[PDB]
Amino acid sequence: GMSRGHCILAHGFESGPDALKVTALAEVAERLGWTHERPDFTDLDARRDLGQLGDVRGRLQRLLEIARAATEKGPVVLAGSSLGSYIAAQVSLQVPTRALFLMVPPTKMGPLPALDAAAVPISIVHAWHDELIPAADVIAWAQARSARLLLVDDGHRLGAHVQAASRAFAELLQSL
Template identity: 35%
Template sequence: MPTVYFAHGKESGPWGSKILALADVARSKGIEVVSPDYSDLADPDERVKRLLEIWNGSQDTTVLVGSSMGGYVSAVASSVIKPAGLFLMAPAFFIPGYAAQEPPPCADRTTIVHGWNDDIVPVEHSIRFARKFRAELHLLDSDHRLNDQIPTLTILFGQMLNNIIEELLK
């Protein structure tokens, strides 16, 4: 079974409402969940280093999930981890000062969810990224946090996990 690694956003923590809900979905499928605390690191690339240290070359199937800055962290780390899935919520792409402006998603499947009313990371950034890398994209009537869309996020995440599990069982 896969292991899911979460990467929370800049102003969030390892067990915010979205991560709790998505972790429940993963656990209901027998999937292990790891949610490191990055709140002591302001630099997104230092967060990438921490994620790679925690992952430590695991041979298990990996799924990376990230929100906002955590979306950036997950996407950058995907170049090393090569996860089965990359689930990104309002990912912080094309942000001035970040080392990688559009880190290529190195995953078997990539899903991006973004709110039309995001005033932190413009929705156009996810549209541009998804178009370039042919990622699955869901645009919702929500803001940056997507907290009012948790039921939809759990459905989309559950679908991704089901597809990954099906592939593993082949």
């Protein structure tokens, strides 16, 4: 449509739609003229009966439905943090996605499929000191796809790099 497009920002495991990093990314989308939404996956994450990271299939299906709806109105950018990145990437494989912004993406997901993504612009922010997702794993995944990769001196939460991550997202949106 008239609008340059819509950003769907997916929070990490046991986080929620008002968490710091997705809220920061929503402010970037706002300031850059994109519409945006932060879906709530907290119910799904609480479903331990379906796995140690909850109902991940449910997360994937919920995001797929939301993205599909959005693509029937105009371009869609998917972004996330950690588990949110994993599902954004997987969903890009199922809906036409303009670009993908991934904070601390896990490359492995137990018995679920390994991280993959559509062959569209990908920008990643990862922590050198991530205790959960070794930096080498994200470096290898990004290298295979020549995805833009920003490594910062932080751990998995990226708690000291919310502005750096916001700027990387802005740079991605400004390129589209």
